[PDB]
Design an enzyme around this catalytic site. Structure first.
Site, mmCIF file in Angstrom:
data_model
loop_
_atom_site.group_PDB
_atom_site.id
_atom_site.type_symbol
_atom_site.label_atom_id
_atom_site.label_comp_id
_atom_site.label_asym_id
_atom_site.label_seq_id
_atom_site.Cartn_x
_atom_site.Cartn_y
_atom_site.Cartn_z
ATOM 1 N N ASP A 175 1.377 -1.097 0.017
ATOM 2 C CA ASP A 175 -0.420 -0.309 0.117
ATOM 3 C C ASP A 175 0.905 1.451 0.158
ATOM 4 O OD1 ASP A 175 -1.873 1.761 0.508
ATOM 5 O OD2 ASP A 175 -2.289 1.687 2.205
ATOM 6 N N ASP A 183 -1.010 5.566 -5.255
ATOM 7 C CA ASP A 183 -2.220 4.451 -4.514
ATOM 8 C C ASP A 183 -2.044 3.030 -4.365
ATOM 9 O OD1 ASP A 183 -2.920 3.458 -2.070
ATOM 10 O OD2 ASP A 183 -3.819 5.468 -1.563
HETATM 11 C C1 H24 Z 1 -5.932 -2.431 -4.018
HETATM 12 O O1 H24 Z 1 -5.872 -2.661 -3.159
HETATM 13 C C2 H24 Z 1 -6.947 -2.645 -2.306
HETATM 14 C C3 H24 Z 1 -8.103 -2.870 -2.571
HETATM 15 C C4 H24 Z 1 -8.982 -3.061 -1.368
HETATM 16 C C5 H24 Z 1 -8.722 -2.270 -0.396
HETATM 17 C C6 H24 Z 1 -7.705 -2.000 0.300
HETATM 18 C C7 H24 Z 1 -7.318 -1.417 1.576
HETATM 19 C C8 H24 Z 1 -7.767 -2.404 2.473
HETATM 20 C C9 H24 Z 1 -7.094 -1.925 3.958
HETATM 21 C C10 H24 Z 1 -7.061 -0.170 3.910
HETATM 22 C C11 H24 Z 1 -6.807 0.297 2.840
HETATM 23 C C12 H24 Z 1 -6.050 1.811 2.737
HETATM 24 C C13 H24 Z 1 -4.676 1.542 4.177
HETATM 25 C C14 H24 Z 1 -6.789 2.619 3.595
HETATM 26 C C15 H24 Z 1 -7.481 3.288 2.107
HETATM 27 O O2 H24 Z 1 -7.960 3.309 2.335
HETATM 28 N N1 H24 Z 1 -6.679 3.901 1.023
HETATM 29 C C16 H24 Z 1 -7.259 4.376 0.239
HETATM 30 C C17 H24 Z 1 -5.194 3.300 1.458
HETATM 31 N N2 H24 Z 1 -4.524 3.633 0.167
HETATM 32 N N3 H24 Z 1 -4.818 1.991 1.980
HETATM 33 C C18 H24 Z 1 -6.192 -0.176 1.368
HETATM 34 C C19 H24 Z 1 -6.507 -2.028 -0.787
#
Ligand code: H24
Ligand code: H24
Lengths: 376, 376
Positions: free
Chosen positions: A34, A219
């Site tokens: 992430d 992101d």
């Molecule tokens: C393709 O990547 C993802 C798909 C579904 C969910 C998540 C994800 C789940 C939980 C938290 C995050 C987070 C830490 C918070 C958030 O909303 N964003 C936009 C992010 N970059 N990471 C992602 C990532």
């Protein structure tokens, strides 16, 4: 780097993860890559959706920092216990490091039921680390304790799906043509400046300062390409009108219903290629990245209310800015060159490509007053 | 209406629900009162978070409509099977009706773990009903099949928490002073037009057309008062600067960390009352609703990383417009007068009130060009 190739699994819908090991002896966990956050948080209690979780009790090397974290999202939240422990990345560098871990002890709408990952690796910078900018992010500890150079690169693929995280450098087998670089405007998120947009070949006479209101970021943890309202509003108008061979539902554009065809019958060519011009490394010079419709219309897989080729519209609105998600990143090899405050883009050696158009990274272009596109 | 008084349970954090019965014989379910959607969807499979679910097999009176629904949200989704069955509201009118039910067969991030409700009652209009505007909403069926007048009213209370849904009319014991009415601009969402905003007593010389970009709606299913960026940006600047006795975290305003004090030590008076002026019933006339800081700073309950009086900032950004959530509604008795295309507001007989300020509904005020505040 042959060792790191293909060390990511998962989709853009559910995220990409890399295998990691934490504590002594090594506990194996699957962790989301992430670049939109800066915390290394792993599930440390038997939430029923989780396959694995971090059991501190079992680690010689764990150390409690007697301090907790609460992290709310839109509908979401997590909460844990700050400590540090010994982290390694099986299919990464052959090192081991003492990094902060937030042991998640409670969460709402965070973990996905049926997902195969159990924590997140926030690769962004200290400034957005919770609770404050002194919780040193994983990657900073990595570079700061080893001889691993301060950069990583990401090739996200997928039709489930795969990819590669090359920690410490670049692997030429993952891209074609040339890498072009845009400045990291500031080291919090991976913020970049978009300076012009075009659909199919025609821009949008829109004050570029809108394209970046109040932020544009890269992101891997956001699925969509996400645009601010004015630009989304503007954007769709132009994609909608471009793509009027056929008449799709008016709420679908807002991602409130999905849209469907059947095998073979996806109308490729009614849909425009989209182009983002990014600020280049030199005054008045830019380059552009061009996404195919493969990228911004992503299959929605097993909707049992059909056996058709459905798709959600992978572009959407934002109160918080442009977000170039995994939908955009799937087209490219993206180099996060933390050493030189810049992000590089090149055509991915794994982008899904018809025998017609393509993804593209091209330049140079001459664009004036690019610095005026950043919101202040 | 003595029968309907206090027939709602729950918080603004987790929603308010009313007991309902579906099928013959009656299956009892707890259902979210949501004026921000138009579908009656109930869980019909043993998702592990659910206390109860709709078992069609057990209903004489169920009828399959051989048609499915898919409803995506931001990270969320649900999916079900359209049918119709016999619905009644124990502590509602003494009738029974044949309404559409979406039996939810699959969902992601929809149900809350530890919640006590199992479906949603979308009270908004056909136009935003999924899959299309021919799926006749519950309330339309109710009025259309019974002698129940086409209006309902809501008193949402809460320090867990309670409230009242008075179906078919008004109950004078739930408000003080006078009801003032704003037009329903269009019958999709419960869309209203805000024409001026003030913090503490001073406006915001902001083109009112911003306050409603692209929408302003009343939503018992949204927790926050949610403002568009420009207005939120503008808003906070003025609340922040107003509330500088003390220095709170810069990310807290963005709802990215929460803020805390201890018993007694919540600084009431550093915080301004906020005022929304709403378009009135007569050309060039408006009225205003005034919210106390009790309303826009809502206790976050059991954060175990503390035993303090924490609070989240109940105001936030939006790509989709102003949303007057349960944070705003808790201050007022809100009458949804579908018969006369208008929503009425009055001081709630249950708003949380210190021995100082108050919630208020006042008028008339003279405001010119109000019709120009609606986005087109
Ligand atoms: C393709 O990547 C993802 C798909 C579904 C969910 C998540 C994800 C789940 C939980 C938290 C995050 C987070 C830490 C918070 C958030 O909303 N964003 C936009 C992010 N970059 N990471 C992602 C990532
Ligand atoms: C205070 O009311 C709520 C608190 C938490 C969650 C919900 C809720 C849960 C699931 C769906 C909805 C929804 C149908 C969709 C949505 O996002 N909005 C804004 C809405 N009005 N209702 C609400 C409501």
């Amino acid at each position: 780097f042959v060792e790191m190739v293909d060390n990511l699994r998962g989709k853009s819908g559910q995220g990409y993860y890399v295998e990691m090991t934490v504590g002594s002896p090594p506990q194996t966990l699957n962790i989301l890559v992430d670049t939109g956050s800066s915390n290394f948080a792993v599930g440390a209690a038997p939430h029923p959706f989780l396959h694995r979780y971090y059991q501190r009790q079992l680690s010689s090397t764990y150390r409690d920092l007697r301090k907790g974290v609460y992290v709310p999202y839109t509908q979401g939240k997590w909460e844990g216990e700050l400590g540090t422990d010994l982290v390694s990345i099986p299919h990464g560098p052959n090192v081991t490091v003492r990094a902060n871990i937030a042991a998640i002890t409670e969460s709402d709408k965070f973990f996905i039921n049926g997902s195969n990952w159990e924590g997140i690796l926030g690769l962004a910078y200290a400034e957005i680390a919770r609770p404050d900018d002194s919780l040193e992010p994983f990657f900073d500890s990595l570079v700061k304790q080893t001889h691993v150079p301060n950069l990583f690169s990401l090739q996200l693929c997928g039709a489930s799906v795969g990819g590669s995280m090359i920690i410490g450098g670049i692997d030429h087998s993952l891209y074609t043509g040339s890498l072009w670089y845009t400045p990291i405007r500031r080291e919090w998120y991976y913020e970049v400046i978009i300076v012009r947009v075009e659909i199919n070949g025609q821009d949008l006479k829109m004050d570029c300062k809108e394209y970046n209101y109040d932020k544009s970021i890269v992101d891997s943890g956001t699925t969509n390409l996400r645009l601010p309202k004015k630009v989304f509003e503007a954007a769709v108008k132009s994609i909608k009108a471009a793509s009027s061979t056929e008449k799709f539902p008016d709420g679908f554009w807002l991602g409130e219903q999905l849209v469907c065809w059947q095998a073979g019958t996806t109308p490729w060519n009614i849909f425009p290629v989209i182009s983002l011009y990014l600020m280049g490394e030199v005054t008045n010079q830019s380059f552009r990245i061009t996404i195919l419709p493969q990228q911004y219309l992503r299959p929605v897989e097993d909707v049992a209310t059909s056996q058709d080729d459905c798709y959600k519209f992978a572009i959407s609105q934002s109160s918080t800015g442009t977000v170039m998600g995994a939908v955009i990143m799937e087209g490219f090899y993206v180099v996060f060159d933390r050493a030189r405050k810049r992000i590089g883009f090149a055509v991915s050696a794994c982008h899904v490509h018809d025998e017609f158009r393509t993804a593209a990274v091209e330049g140079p272009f001459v664009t004036l007053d690019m610095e005026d596109c950043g919101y202040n």
